[PDB]
Design a protein around this ligand. Structure first.
Ligand SMILES: *P(=O)(O)OCC(C)(C)[C@H](O)C(=O)NCCC(=O)NCCS
Ligand SMILES: *P(=O)(O)OCC(C)(C)[C@H](O)C(=O)NCCC(=O)NCCS
Lengths: 412, 80, 412, 80
């Protein structure tokens, strides 16, 4: 069918403000997880998170507009600006050329978007009445306002789409973009996943279901995917961004080619609202469907690997079953140890990370591997990055509601 | 007195300046929000809210409709 | 490409608990707007809404699980149960047959999902700390839990996708399901748009930007699309659901066939975060791309028509422009007078309404047409339904962020 | 007092029954939540919270972790 390439990338997370600084720190096995300081978490059972402390919103938008955008959108406007410039597509005004604008869209993803803004205006309304609800509340908080602000910022007028499938949103935003190009609804798609939920009701929500790690004393050992001492995820904030283009278009305009899109898979467990399907059954089907569609040898897997008991175990089971045996599973790592699990943004961050691993022949490690889990018996690239050339990479994402998405990119 | 009036006008200039992200230079009594200050439906109503916060006011909804230049807002706050 | 038909439908709104009662009332020009009573709005500037007062969640859910679902999910379960039953797909245990289950997915749409749940738990946390955050908060609130709860109730394990494009989410949810089936990712999809946000911060959010009608002294004349005395929309709640099915597979099954999918269009304005593009330019392009893809004669248009100044005006201009002239615009009606504008659910509700209008040769009116607007000069089927047979229908949806979606269904 | 203890038992039984749509028939001291009452990881953590909310108490996380049957929960609350 139609062919699709990645021509621009960007990302911002707790280990870097750009994809270059971020990936290096991730491949070195550093860790951006810190103690929450965006809010007073002193009374909370969970006081750590993958916070970005160096991010300045007034660098990506003028000071008047900062109050109109939730933090996840500010992060998205940074990552997309990097990717859009990286792509070389912008004109002299830093805007998409007019003759191309109708055919370039945006596919955005977030699990919940502007939670802190909903929380704040909810409290305003509950303390002072509705007249204290700020006019900029709604458009600062809706998930699709990522595509809203980004499309106005770059003048792209193609399909403007938003995925909100929980912790798989960033991967589904990639796939919906692919589908749109494959069906000739666009020739290019800005893709961006973005999430920033480090706020009281955000941390308390995941604490009250015991989803989060409570290793507060050690923020840099808390997130440990597949380890035997894993005791919950650590919430991270960030955004990742890709530019996708139909292959001939990219060639004609002389594009940088990071990767070619190879295959995808989507499924639902129809089992449980938070727990994974037994044996990762839904994950298995999405992974098989992506592998059958890519028809390439995957040399590296970026796992969802959120540091929970069920995900790491049921994701490991599904990986064996799809590759046949534990010996046939390619090298796997989760980078959630380094930057935390970034929820709706994870799928997008981990596609950028995975393609860069391929580009550089450097496979980042899973950090904090201290005690092998006998039931998690794969090669998780423990602690130290592996220099290895791969020709294709696969990234997995699963969300509450049992929704699964998998993407495979291959070498250009 | 005249000094009190000047203080009130300067406070209004500060709020209108921070909200619309413009210098206190352009916010003159004859300055129009949409034409002269680069505002929009959502910016004017949000500026009006901020004033009802900086100056203990509660402008009723009908008076906010007839607001074209910063002078309207300043004179309403004066009549306070 | 592959052929797509509608084989089951369901809907709930402020004028009925199922599609038969509701459509009858809507075609008769009845109005479900009333005074708000699901919270204390006595101190609010807007005190009217399309509230559903006869809905009992315990009729669709085990009473013990009502607490796990936001009200929008409860409405989605009501509508999807009706459509699934209507489709004849369900087995003796009201679940999808296991050998069809992997190829039937779910496409869900909502603007914000469980806002009242986020508001309530934000307030618990602020007033009494994170130990008062209810454990069922997150999974009651996420937009994609519509697909989560429904896929579990019906045992459908195909692609599980959610659209969060604001007031266009319901229509985009249809389009993502169509795209999924076109690309062979599923043979059937359950589509459902659902929204319930009649809560203090939801009403406060929209009144803060002066988007809501303030005719609280006359709830059943407040919503009046295209009328000269319109003054803002009226918020409604509800859910619409469709079963989409590849054509050969539907005929094999003996399915009933309500309609055939004919075309769609999607675009972004890249203009303003709440106001439409000048001349409804993005709407024009989305409508043009749907009409060019359908290649049929559209005999009825269910307009977005929310009863604000801007939409009704610029939607009318874009309609004229796309059909060529005022005389060449098919009959147009907006049913938001009758049931309110239902935000993320509107596109799903209005696709059901449009298709039923086709099925029964009855075009429902735009009600409360008392004063013609010179700038709004189309045929809006004023005040009383028109008995007229049509062979295709078009439904428009636009959302904050300038995101547009259009779908056309044709007789079959 | 023994009467006070029996009243506390009645209250706990009612709570476990409602939160889990189960009749007071199955809420016996030997009823384990997952096998005998049909609960899950989320229902249990939710039952324990409305216990702390209705009885104005605060079950520390360690004791909550060992809860396997209604008998155990009631005995912990009595020890309080
Ligand atoms: P139960 O054992 O299901 O308890 C609920 C918890 C919170 C443990 C929940 O099921 C869970 O943590 N599931 C793990 C699934 C997972 O990590 N999925 C990825 C989305 S974050
Ligand atoms: P401003 O002149 O942008 O005014 C703000 C309001 C709230 C009037 C805004 O422009 C508006 O009306 N936006 C939505 C218009 C509409 O009806 N859109 C359809 C999607 S709800």
């Amino acid at each position: 069918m139609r062919r699709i390439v990645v021509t621009g990338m960007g990302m911002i997370n707790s280990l870097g403000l750009n994809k270059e600084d971020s990936f290096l720190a991730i491949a070195k096995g550093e860790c951006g997880i810190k103690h929450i300081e965006s809010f007073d978490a002193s009374a909370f059972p969970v006081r750590i998170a993958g916070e970005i402390t160096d991010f300045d919103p007034t660098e990506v938008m003028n000071p008047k507009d900062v109050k109109k955008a939730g933090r996840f959108i500010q992060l998205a406007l940074k990552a997309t600006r990097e990717a859009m410039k990286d792509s070389g597509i912008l004109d002299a005004h830093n805007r998409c050329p007019e003759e191309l604008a109708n055919r370039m869209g945006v596919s955005s993803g977030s699990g919940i978007g502007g939670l802190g803004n909903i929380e704040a205006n909810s409290i305003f309304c509950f303390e002072k009445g509705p007249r204290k609800v700020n006019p900029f509340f709604i458009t600062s908080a809706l998930v699709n306002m990522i595509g809203g602000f980004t499309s106005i910022e770059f003048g792209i007028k193609g399909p403007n789409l938003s995925s909100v499938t929980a912790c798989a949103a960033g991967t589904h935003a990639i796939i919906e973009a692919v589908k749109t190009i494959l069906l000739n609804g666009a020739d290019r798609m800005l893709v961006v996943g973005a999430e920033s939920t480090i706020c009281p009701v955000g941390i308390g929500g995941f604490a009250s279901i015991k989803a989060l790690s409570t290793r507060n004393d050690e923020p840099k050992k808390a997130s440990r995917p597949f380890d035997k001492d894993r005791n919950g995820f650590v919430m991270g904030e960030g955004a990742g961004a890709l530019v996708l283009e139909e292959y001939e278009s990219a060639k004609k305009r002389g594009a940088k080619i990071y990767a070619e899109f190879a295959g995808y898979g989507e499924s639902g467990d129809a089992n449980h609202i938070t727990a994974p399907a037994p044996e990762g059954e839904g994950a298995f089907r999405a992974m098989k469907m992506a592998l059958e569609m890519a028809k390439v040898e995957v040399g590296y897997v970026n796992a969802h690997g959120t540091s929970t008991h069920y995900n790491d175990l049921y994701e490991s089971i599904a990986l064996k079953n799809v590759f046949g045996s534990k010996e046939k599973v390619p090298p796997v790592s989760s980078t959630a140890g380094q930057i935390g699990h970034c929820l709706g943004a994870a799928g997008a961050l981990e596609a950028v990370i995975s393609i860069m691993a391929m580009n550089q022949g450097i496979l980042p490690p899973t950090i904090n591997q201290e005690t092998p889990d006998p039931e998690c018996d794969l090669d998780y690239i423990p602690n130290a990055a592996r220099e290895k050339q791969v020709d294709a990479v696969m990234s997995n994402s699963f969300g509450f509601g049992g929704t699964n998405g998998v993407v495979i990119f291959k070498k250009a | 007195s005249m000094g009190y009036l000047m203080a009130l006008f300067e406070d209004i200039q500060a709020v209108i300046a921070e909200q619309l992200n413009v210098d206190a230079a352009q916010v003159t009594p004859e300055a129009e929000f949409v034409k002269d200050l680069g505002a929009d439906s959502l910016d004017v109503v949000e500026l009006i809210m901020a004033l009802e916060e900086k100056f203990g006011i509660e402008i009723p909804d009908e008076q906010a409709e007839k607001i074209v230049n910063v002078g309207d807002v300043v004179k309403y706050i004066e009549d306070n």
